[PDB]
Design a protein around this ligand. Sequence first.
Ligand SMILES: NC(=O)c1ccc[n+]([C@@H]2O[C@H](COP(=O)([O-])OP(=O)(O)OC[C@H]3O[C@@H](n4cnc5c(N)ncnc54)[C@H](O)[C@@H]3O)[C@@H](O)[C@H]2O)c1
Ligand SMILES: NC(=O)c1ccc[n+]([C@@H]2O[C@H](COP(=O)([O-])OP(=O)(O)OC[C@H]3O[C@@H](n4cnc5c(N)ncnc54)[C@H](O)[C@@H]3O)[C@@H](O)[C@H]2O)c1
Lengths: 293, 291
Amino acid sequence: KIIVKHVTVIGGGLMGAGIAQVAAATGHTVVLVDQTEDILAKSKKGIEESLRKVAKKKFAENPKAGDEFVEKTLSTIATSTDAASVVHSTDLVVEAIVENLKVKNELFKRLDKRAAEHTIFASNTSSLQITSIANATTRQDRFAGLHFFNPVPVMKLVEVIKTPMTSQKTFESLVDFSKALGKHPVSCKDTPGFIVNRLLVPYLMEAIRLYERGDASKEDIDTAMKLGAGYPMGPFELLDYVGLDTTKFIVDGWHEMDAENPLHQPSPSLNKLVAENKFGKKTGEGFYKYKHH
Amino acid sequence: KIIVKHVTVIGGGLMGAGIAQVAAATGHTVVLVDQTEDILAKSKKGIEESLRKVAKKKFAENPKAGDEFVEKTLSTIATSTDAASVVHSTDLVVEAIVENLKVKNELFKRLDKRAAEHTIFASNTSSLQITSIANATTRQDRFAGLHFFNPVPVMKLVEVIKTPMTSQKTFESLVDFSKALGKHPVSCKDTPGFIVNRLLVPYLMEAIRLYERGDASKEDIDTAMKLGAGYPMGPFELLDYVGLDTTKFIVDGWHEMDAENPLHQPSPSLNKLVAENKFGKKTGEGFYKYK
Ligand SMILES: NC(=O)c1ccc[n+]([C@@H]2O[C@H](COP(=O)([O-])OP(=O)(O)OC[C@H]3O[C@@H](n4cnc5c(N)ncnc54)[C@H](O)[C@@H]3O)[C@@H](O)[C@H]2O)c1
Ligand SMILES: NC(=O)c1ccc[n+]([C@@H]2O[C@H](COP(=O)([O-])OP(=O)(O)OC[C@H]3O[C@@H](n4cnc5c(N)ncnc54)[C@H](O)[C@@H]3O)[C@@H](O)[C@H]2O)c1
């Protein structure tokens, strides 16, 4: 077996940055990639802030030990603006850039040419077909989905997505990598939503519909699911948390593919908030208003 | 206003006994009704056991008081095999009998003729139209749904289901009672599944379907929802907890009442387990095997 040691993370946004942090804090050598040296600087700055915050809590009894912990993790994270310049010596590429099929394919089609023969390619895409992105290369046996959850340093789950072309060898290596990250990998076919979103999102939509239908208030529904179902967050609270735009985008996709399916019918309230740019906790307001920090 | 103090709980089963216990534990006078003395005898025994299990921990430093707390509570629960003889002056009737609409209606239609004027009637039914029961009486203004969750003494949520005919006075009385029970009432219309089950059951069926499609294993799905969604139990673990037959029954109902809706399509796997009497934990086996 070829064990993942060097990881190239493409995209230093909410997800990528978190993936880089966890990979680096667990002993992997990482190269975080993004479009500009500024974006990278900002992303790395966010990773530091997050680590120091974790350190000031784990090593509360010893600041020096906390600093060392942060410095060692942070120092194993290099940054480059062109992934092509470093994949020839990387073991795994984890992509977390814009959720646009064409962009991702252009990305992987090119990297395919620079990457070492054993290099595995993985996409953290939530709504696109791993199979579609994989066929943008001739490395399908070494391509799969590696789906994380926000905040990455905190959420322990990772969905390892296998296309009909992914090799068992590629699959096992990602499972191993997942455990090496301190996460718990689960397996799922390359089907829309995979496991979590496929069971989570349609439920959140049903919650919105029960509310639009006026059967009960948002507040009551949230109370009902937290106390009655034991959920950490009521559905409206979670919607604002994951992002109403993020959610609408996923559902539009499903609706597009099967407009006749009632489960994916659009939500007026959801569309309205998104139109009004009320994306949730991101913009200080979604279905609920939040204290603009 | 109408302050509920004397309560009639019809049905001393899983839900019934729990409602009786919490009502009694919170200072209400309670009369528990069921079909036989043996059933009632066992129901009241289960209540005593549950109360004692608690007292032993809470009154460790003073067992005497603990036993008195239990004594007081049990002595505030009466039992009867004849509902009609009890409702003449009760403030509230909470029903939790077999999920059969006919039986329920006959029950309430009969009791409507016995209950005092101010008496409020309420059903704990999960998959039935509160309206399809209130109309079985002429007390529609004092009829509502009051849906509790198992274990009643643990679950703090209570869904107060109001119908178009339900009085506001009746509504606020049930809300006040819910709070008196130390519970937290939420409001919903007499729409199927109310809030909780309406949003939970279909999700659980979807989990089964993902499994039946061959997309992932039950274990991973369970793990996925626990770690990825922060749920206490994975869907299959929960299905076995709430009961597979219980669930199937609710899904079939919605399926018959609207066979066009994809969320209510029957599950081969679910039906099979029910057929071969594998109902979940309460049977030692459902999607998983226990003990
Ligand atoms: N945030 C979530 O809830 C979540 C959870 C799981 C998976 N995802 C998936 O992860 C991916 C990124 O999500 P995000 O929330 O981290 O996004 P984001 O907008 O926070 O960050 C994306 C980063 O990608 C960079 N980027 C865009 N195009 C690029 C290109 N051609 N080359 C290099 N870098 C490029 C941007 O500059 C940006 O810093 C998406 O595919 C999304 O569907 C999101
Ligand atoms: N998941 C649950 O267990 C749950 C949760 C919420 C609501 N409910 C609802 O609560 C009610 C009962 O559920 P349960 O789980 O307590 O059931 P159960 O079968 O444990 O207990 C019902 C009790 O009702 C008695 N009963 C039946 N018909 C009667 C009649 N005509 N008169 C007097 N007693 C009668 C039985 O003998 C039995 O002891 C149902 O309407 C159901 O839909 C169940």
